[PDB]
């Protein structure tokens, strides 16, 4: 689940 291009600049892991 989860695996839409990864590109979230907000709370990268």
Same mark, same amino acid.
């Given at each position: 689940?989860? !695996? !839409? /291009? @990864?590109? /979230? @600049? /907000? $709370? $990268?892991?």
């Amino acid at each position: 689940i989860l !695996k !839409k /291009w @990864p590109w /979230w @600049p /907000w $709370r $990268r892991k």
